[PDB]
């Protein structure tokens, strides 16, 4: 999907749905929010693999399966040398880096909630 333009302000129907997508620029943060929210939403395949050490290092397996550990986003966007929304698409990757901060804010995580003392993710965000 292409024509790297700004976000067309429809003024105003899905702007609240854009605000849920915000957790502008045309598509990348606009669709990829549904992609990753769909991903970690789909990655809640537990609530039946519980009463064991799944709460252990399988949590770290969920850590390695990041917002697919962001090189998957940060290869093709790293590869795409194109003047169309150059750094404006990446304004939704500085702003999807604010969604990387939303991902390390998507941090009421597991073990059911313990220890709530750190859940940071910013290696691939770095």
């Amino acid at each position: 999907d292409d024509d790297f333009m700004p976000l067309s302000i429809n003024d105003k129907t899905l702007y609240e749905k854009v605000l849920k997508i915000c957790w502008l620029y045309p598509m990348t943060c606009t669709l990829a929010k549904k992609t990753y929210s769909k991903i970690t939403a789909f990655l809640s395949i537990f609530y039946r693999h519980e009463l064991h050490t799944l709460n252990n290092i399988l949590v770290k397996t969920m850590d390695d399966i990041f917002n697919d550990i962001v090189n998957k986003k940060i290869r093709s966007k790293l590869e795409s040398t194109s003047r169309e929304e150059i750094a404006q698409i990446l304004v939704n990757l500085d702003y999807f880096i604010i969604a990387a901060k939303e991902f390390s804010n998507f941090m009421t995580r597991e073990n059911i909630l313990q220890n709530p003392d750190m859940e940071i993710r910013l290696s691939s965000i770095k």
């Binding site: 050490t53 252990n56 073990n111 003392d117 750190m118 859940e119 940071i120």
Partner: protein
């Protein structure tokens, strides 16, 4: 009968000795969760939350081990072996740790 009951006493000290060595070596075993703890960090790794899962395993089978050990045997020996071997191996466990 003094050689006899003497020998039964020797089996008692051997057996309770073996139980105390079992719990203590379960602990010193369990401290090797730090070996490796996957590069206990340099100056920070912040964050830095929690909690070295092998140590939670140590707490777990320690807890159930004391549960069943309190189930079968009598109290005073359990308090003895568990008390001395647990606290001492905790301390020197931190020392070599």
């Amino acid at each position: 009968k003094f050689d006899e009951t003497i020998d039964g006493f020797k089996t008692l000290k051997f057996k309770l000795i073996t139980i105390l060595r079992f719990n203590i070596r379960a602990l010193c075993i369990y401290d090797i969760g730090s070996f490796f703890q996957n590069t206990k960090i340099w100056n920070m790794d912040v964050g830095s939350i929690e909690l070295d899962q092998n140590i939670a395993s140590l707490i777990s089978e320690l807890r159930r081990t004391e549960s069943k050990l309190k189930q079968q045997l009598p109290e005073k020996e359990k308090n003895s072996i568990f008390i001395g071997l647990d606290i001492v191996n905790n301390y020197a466990l931190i020392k070599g740790a």
